């Protein structure tokens, strides 16, 4: 159910080589909160990859600590997929966490590396979150 303490979800960004603004995935519910993958170009230059939690809510009383593995899938060889880990207390003022320079833009878009196909790149997040505070009192 949406109350699950962990989940793995993916989001495929299309027309990747042309990305010029931040893109957000639909929500994946964990601990009954909406988690989303956020991808943004940073300085072409590098791919920004962040995990976002409960950003839409106007609440300023919530908090949720979680650990996660952010990974860019290599479709040719999963062992070649690139991942980084995070641990963060998410709350209204710090509702997303990740890396502005997750991977070099030239590497992810290299047609011979295995991360891009038909100008599509798939991002994956495995999030393990603790019970949130200040939400479902």
């Amino acid at each position: 159910t949406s109350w699950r303490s962990e989940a793995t979800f993916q989001f495929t960004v299309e027309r990747f080589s042309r990305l010029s603004e931040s893109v957000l995935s639909p929500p994946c519910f964990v601990r009954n909160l909406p988690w989303k993958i956020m991808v943004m170009p940073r300085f072409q230059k590098s791919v920004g990859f962040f995990l976002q939690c409960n950003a839409e809510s106007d609440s300023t009383s919530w908090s949720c600590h979680a650990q996660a593995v952010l990974k860019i899938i290599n479709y040719r060889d999963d062992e070649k997929s690139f991942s980084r880990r995070i641990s963060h207390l998410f709350f209204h003022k710090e509702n997303d966490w990740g890396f502005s320079n997750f991977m070099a833009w030239s590497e992810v878009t290299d047609p011979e590396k295995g991360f891009i196909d038909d100008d599509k790149v798939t991002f994956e997040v495995f999030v393990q979150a603790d019970a949130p505070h200040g939400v479902a009192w």
């Binding site: 943004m40 920004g48 966490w97 890396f99």
Partner: peptide, 4 residues
């Protein structure tokens, strides 16, 4: 890691 940091905020966007």
């Amino acid at each position: 890691a940091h905020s966007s």
